[PDB]
């Protein structure tokens, strides 16, 4: 469907992420532990009897219709996590995300409460400025002609360098900010 | 009466004061909510006295104190009025949310805006002690709106999160069509009968009143959440659960029963309304409980809980019992707010999880809440001599007992057996059982804080319906003679639903499984009337909106008619006048040809 | 009223002979002078008028107006004095007084006792706010915006001279206070159907009707600031000010000859609403907000019932404000992001506090939250209209609806849910900008204790 | 409420989570043990591993990110990266 | 069997029911290469401009300002008045206003017919 | 199967500067370097100061004018005695007993 | 940004339409334009219509909360389509069912009211009785007037 770093979900990928949905919503209707434990190890046999089938328009018809049969009972609102999308406390603490170019604009009155942390700031954003050079000129070199063919990057192949476009992803906001 | 007014207007100057605390505040203030909640509880005191002035004589007054504006005939003034309703609401009100400020210091102890949080819950107690003392419809009005636009601040309170801005401007937009009912029915008034004042309303008493009991009962509609216009209510458990617990439980929502409780001499000799209101409330109540029996969020179940608790209220009015009805919400006040703040102490414990499928085993990992939850369930399913019995039992024997209609009677009879049933399977799966939540145990209950206002809570559910029950006057004649089915109908209904909800999760507990039904998830997906409407409605009013106004109209057609058609006009005209050979010989003949047209076809000669 | 005309002529040489670097200084705070001198207007009589000579009066329609016209301008310097920082001093100096021109014509406006006194003074009110929209806007169509606003006027406007000067030559008179004595009934025919419809057509483009409103989000958008704030504040209020004082010598043939103008403004303010549910640019959302309100001005003054007149002034006053508010707000957003996009920056109240607090009271004034004026002016309307029929409540409740709909799709399209992630320049609000807003919002607030000052010559 | 975690509390648990698995002998495994090649574990056997892990930590690891958790070192890791640990 | 999900406009087919999810064939998997192709040199030059650390202002997104001048001004070079445009500008233009002009009139006529015989019950009234 | 060797370098490589960037998010001991900046008021302050205000207010200001405080009569029972004529209310009639 | 960026009319020649797939950032078969019945749209390509909801929520957009990707082809409902508006993500049930049942379960609900009303419930007792002609005069009547007695005997 939409990957990051694939262009297609592969048979074996389809097959494990049913059985993780089937399990879930299984676990949502047997709210009881033994019981969800004894209809999970039903539902493993189920999943064990065609593990071992070669034909591939075979394995296709049993995938759609295990994905039918799911379909038909899956249930009304399964358990969600608190975190997880469509949770309770999904995005909850974003709007305490602030982002640290916000930093920048803080009055000296109020920098001088913070010596220390505004130091090492400082020289974090050194350390960002003396690299952005060497990483793009990593990346303009490792890109195939005709552009990326994924999404993923390249780690930095030798010493002193950091990997390239690395800054958003390391100073990215706390979890509990 | 120089005692009464005094401590009546300085309890709402002394609730009006912290709000000038916070705002001309320079530095951090040092604990502001102990200030509030301070406040709070000497103006439950303040606010205490009168309503012993009136149990004792029965003192009822009218303080018109500032003119504000004289449009013609119309005199509007900022007029009070002390009353039953008055006297015996405030210190239920005040007595709530100072239990749930309690609890919010507790809760939202780690939140970095505390300070706006209790500056947003003192704004709503202000608006609603405005709405509920109001004397005109302007100011019953204003608190309408105030404590509409508090619940939008409040609900969408974790603003970087998309579904608390879905439901504060679902909420905003059902409180806007009861806005609608509100506005239709203060304009039938002022043209009708020249005021807008209720004492004149009630002196002039009409008889052709259809149309504003109409409005009346579309506005409490809207505010009480009655079917129809019901899911903002259970929508509105995004925000956190002090907001719930006080407005969408026990103060906001009962806003709208309220405004057909003081209208009750115009609605008193109308037939009409009486019946649209009685279906009104039964179709509610036995909707929303058939909702809640297969709900697995605890906070959708107690929110559920309430709007069938609405239903009833509306019930009760519509059998021409509005006192009982304000006996029934001074009752549901109490134990409605400590389930949520117990649901909520739950809710804290187990790390942010609502779900009842992750609970179990907290009836010896958490005595205290355990006690007070399964006491506010008795008092809600209606146990003999708790405060739900005040007013619950006495709603069922005069609905029994009366010229009624016949279904919403069997309705209302049901829905009390489903409230039986959902509230022991909240019972057996958030304490009974094994535990089922995360491997790592957190289970503290031990603040003084939360401890503290549950047990004032408790007290309250204990014996407040048995005091206020007995010290109110008899404002009508009590229904007390009555057959022996009749008058057991409510303990038997209640004791049905307990023992078929028992046989319920006894089958649960089995190893067997079964494929759903429609009627699960019928129950389950709340009817089909969100899914339906909420994809539906705004999709109709979006696409008219942009294919039709926004780009067939005045993108194209308004631009077509007079401007861009003019303009082609002049420029054709001007591209036929300016295209000239340059020639003097065309030039010439076309003078020879004016000549001969002026003279002989115009006759210019004559 | 010759008190207020010079010293507002004299902020000319006062711009004219600064320094380079004073001409903001002293040209705000000699406006902010004038501007508490204008309260002297209030002494208004219950029976009669302040009549001041031959050519001027002021009753106590005009009286607001004028108190909010003199007190609008120092918030336009206030506000029109970051964009023109790099400016030319001479452009500079011509922009502050093509504004001190546009508030001597406007106060000239409103006081004007003779009809074809206050009909040239209010076309001469074009001239500054064409140049101004045509010259500092900063989009490639001001040109046509400036086009499409001009000939819409004069198109709606020269009719209405020659039906003035038939008044004139008629009656005798065109004195506003011999014509309340003078006034004759006018009959049914075609020839006084056309009088109706020139008499009416240039206030209904100017307000304006629903159909004639294609200019407005097109002016009010390529418009700076201070031009926006100029065009949604006062004037849209000239047509309000032409349909009172013109009414009067068209009875009775106006009560079905209000039919279509009354469909038109009823239906208008639904569609221009849902427009504005499907806005992606907020300058051009304020401006279909405006043309909303203005319909239900029109409404209220063509049923001419007193509730009407006092709800249409209240109204009038109170949009003005807001409506001024508000594309002060925008504009600070546009300076922030350089962009009129409504989705592009977003989630600014993480990074931007106390403008999204004024954000929420813009927004809460504009849906007509009680007691503020707007709701009084939108009530009395209200009132006023079902006692001319009913089903316009339905319509009313509608409107209203949709109203509490845009604006809070407003406020939390802009200011909640996640920031945008690329956008790092959101400065922290200026003591400038914060200031304009609470000189916005404090008069507004203040005057629900007082309410009985904007409420028109019949309360 | 909340309290914190660290490297050695994550490990601890994670291998108590999986010592606890029937299928897995307790002698054999270790923090960088893998689990098709190590173990003899099947693609099934990993994903009731993660789901085992997600219900002990209380958080919902995606699919795309399950698919690549095949030692107990990149699921310490991944948690510790998830939950921004050693603050 | 079961019964079978039928999609709606407002309820999509899944995409676990989809039948050409499960197509193998290199025709698709060459389409999915060259989409996933396009994205990730999009996404290349967004990072690129998005981690400079010499930067301070808006990455400008040439795909909002086309939906915005299509959304704005494209509509009238784009209109071509026939049977369709003028079908649906003649219903929803001078429809409603019809519509509630006759209502009105004839709510209007009622009420002041009613008032000149004096069978409509006025008697408090006195604001209007 | 699992990550390749360049995803699992650069996964190293982003978690060290990850960890080394939440490290540096700690506070000092010195900071924050904060800037050199009756047990009854509330019961006198909160209650009795606006009680003598309003109390003024309405007894000087409000009562003044006319209908400001309309106040319900007084309930009137059988046996009664008035404040102000001194009348004593007649009891009721004899009760017709049936319990 | 230039004039060459911004939409333009529909296209007419495989040309015209493989220039403005390549301009909008998309494949030349997966284009496909609004169909040119006059109503505006231009070459503007026709997205399939479905809200931001049915996005995946475990990628990393660019624009997390609208789920949006920098320089993607943006819908022409995109801000109707947004998770604060209108969704579209499948049911668990049939969107007719759905429909038939409650418009069914409401039909009922307010036939059988209707029938309740028809035949309501009451007690075996005659009406209520109040002393001095069904209380005359506190009911608003005029005392120089005199009513109709009604006159309750024992039973
Ligand atoms: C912070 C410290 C301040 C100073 C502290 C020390 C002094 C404190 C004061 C001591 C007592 C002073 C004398 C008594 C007070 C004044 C008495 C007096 O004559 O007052 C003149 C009058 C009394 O009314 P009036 O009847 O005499 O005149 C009304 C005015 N006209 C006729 C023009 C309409 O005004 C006031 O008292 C004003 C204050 C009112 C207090 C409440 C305000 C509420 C605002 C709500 C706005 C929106 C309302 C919407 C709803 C309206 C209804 C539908
Ligand atoms: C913004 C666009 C829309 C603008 C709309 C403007 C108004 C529309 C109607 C205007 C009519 C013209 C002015 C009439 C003034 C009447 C004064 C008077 O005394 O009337 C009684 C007089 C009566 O004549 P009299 O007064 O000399 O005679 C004495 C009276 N009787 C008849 C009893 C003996 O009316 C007229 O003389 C004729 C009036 C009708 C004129 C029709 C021609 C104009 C048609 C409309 C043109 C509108 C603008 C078009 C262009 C738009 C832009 C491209
Ligand atoms: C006693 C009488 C009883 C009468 C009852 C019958 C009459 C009333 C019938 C119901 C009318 C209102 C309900 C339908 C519209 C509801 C819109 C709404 O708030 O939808 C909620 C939705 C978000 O919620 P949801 O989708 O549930 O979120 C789940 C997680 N994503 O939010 C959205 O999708 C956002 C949508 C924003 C735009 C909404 C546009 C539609 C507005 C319709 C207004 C209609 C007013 C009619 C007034 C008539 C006056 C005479
Ligand atoms: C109030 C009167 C309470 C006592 C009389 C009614 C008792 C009753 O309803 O019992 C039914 C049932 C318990 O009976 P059962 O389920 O058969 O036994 C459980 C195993 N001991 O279930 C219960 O007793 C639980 C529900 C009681 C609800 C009482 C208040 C309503
Ligand atoms: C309600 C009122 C409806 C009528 C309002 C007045 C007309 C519409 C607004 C003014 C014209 C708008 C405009 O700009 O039209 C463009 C069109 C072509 O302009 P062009 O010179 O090609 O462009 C310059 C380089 N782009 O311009 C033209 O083709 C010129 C049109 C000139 C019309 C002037 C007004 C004449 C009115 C009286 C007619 C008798
Ligand atoms: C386009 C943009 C959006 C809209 C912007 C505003 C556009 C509309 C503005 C003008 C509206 C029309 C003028 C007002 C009509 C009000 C009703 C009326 O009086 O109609 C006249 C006539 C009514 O018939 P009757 O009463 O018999 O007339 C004899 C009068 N001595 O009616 C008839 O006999 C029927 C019609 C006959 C032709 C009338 C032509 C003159 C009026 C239009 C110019």
Sequence with gaps: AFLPSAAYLTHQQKVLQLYKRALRHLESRCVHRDKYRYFACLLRARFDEHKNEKDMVKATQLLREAEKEFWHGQHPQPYIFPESPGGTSYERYECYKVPEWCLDDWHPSEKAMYPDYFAKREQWKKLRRESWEREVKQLQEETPVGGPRTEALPPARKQGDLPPLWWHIVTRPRERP | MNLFSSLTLVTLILLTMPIAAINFNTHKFTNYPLYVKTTISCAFITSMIPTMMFIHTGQEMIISNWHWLTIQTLKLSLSFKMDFFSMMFVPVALFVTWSIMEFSMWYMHSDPNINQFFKYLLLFLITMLILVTANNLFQLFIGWEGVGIMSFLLIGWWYGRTDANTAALQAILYNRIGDIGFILAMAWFLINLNTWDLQQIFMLNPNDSNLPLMGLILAATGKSAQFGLHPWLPSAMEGPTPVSALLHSSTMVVAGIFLLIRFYPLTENNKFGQSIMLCLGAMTTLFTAMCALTQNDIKKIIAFSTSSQLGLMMVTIGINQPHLAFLHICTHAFFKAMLFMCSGSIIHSLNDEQDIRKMGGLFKAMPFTTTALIIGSLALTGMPFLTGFYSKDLIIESANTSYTNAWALLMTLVATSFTAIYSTRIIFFALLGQPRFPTLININENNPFLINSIKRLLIGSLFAGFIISNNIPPMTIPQMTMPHYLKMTALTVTILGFILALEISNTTHYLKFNYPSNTFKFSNLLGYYPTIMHRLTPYMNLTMSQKSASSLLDLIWLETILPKTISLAQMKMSTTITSQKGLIKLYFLSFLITILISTTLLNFHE | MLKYIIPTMMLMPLTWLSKNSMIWINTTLHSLLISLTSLLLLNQFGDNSLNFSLTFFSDSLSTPLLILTMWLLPLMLMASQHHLSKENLARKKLFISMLILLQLFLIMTFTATELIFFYIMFEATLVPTLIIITRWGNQTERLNAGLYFLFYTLAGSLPLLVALIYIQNTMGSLNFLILQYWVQPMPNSWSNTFMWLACMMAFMVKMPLYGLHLWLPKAHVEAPIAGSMVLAAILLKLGGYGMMRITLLLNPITDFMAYPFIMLSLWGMIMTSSICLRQTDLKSLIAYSSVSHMALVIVAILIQTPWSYMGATALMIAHGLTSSMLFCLANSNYERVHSRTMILARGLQTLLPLMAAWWLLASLTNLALPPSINLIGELFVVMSTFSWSNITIILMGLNMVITALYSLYMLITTQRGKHTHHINNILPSFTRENALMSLHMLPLLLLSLNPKIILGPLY | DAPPLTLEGIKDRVLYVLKLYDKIDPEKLSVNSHFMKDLGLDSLDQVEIIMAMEDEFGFEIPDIDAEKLMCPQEIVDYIADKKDVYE | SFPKYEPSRLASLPTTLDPAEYDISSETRKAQAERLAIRSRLKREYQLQYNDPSRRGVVEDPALIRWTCARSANVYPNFRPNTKTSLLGALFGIGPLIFWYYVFKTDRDRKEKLIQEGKLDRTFNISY | ?99 | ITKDMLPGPYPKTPEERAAAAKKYNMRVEDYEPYPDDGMGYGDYPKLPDRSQQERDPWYDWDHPDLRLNWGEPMHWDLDMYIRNRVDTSPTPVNWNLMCKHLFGFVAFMLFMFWVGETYPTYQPVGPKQYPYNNLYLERGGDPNKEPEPVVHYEI
């Design chain 6, 1 to 99: 199967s699992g990550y390749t060797p360049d995803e699992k370098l650069r996964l190293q490589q982003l978690r060290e500067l990850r960890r080394r960037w939440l490290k540096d998010q700690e506070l000092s001991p010195r900071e924050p370097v904060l800037p050199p900046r009756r047990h009854s008021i509330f019961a006198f302050t909160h209650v009795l100061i606006p009680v003598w205000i309003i109390h003024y207010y309405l007894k000087y200001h409000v009562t003044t004018k006319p209908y400001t405080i309309v106040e319900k009569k007084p309930r009137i029972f059988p046996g009664d005695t008035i404040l102000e004529t001194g009348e004593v209310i007649p009891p009721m009639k004899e009760f017709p007993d049936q319990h």
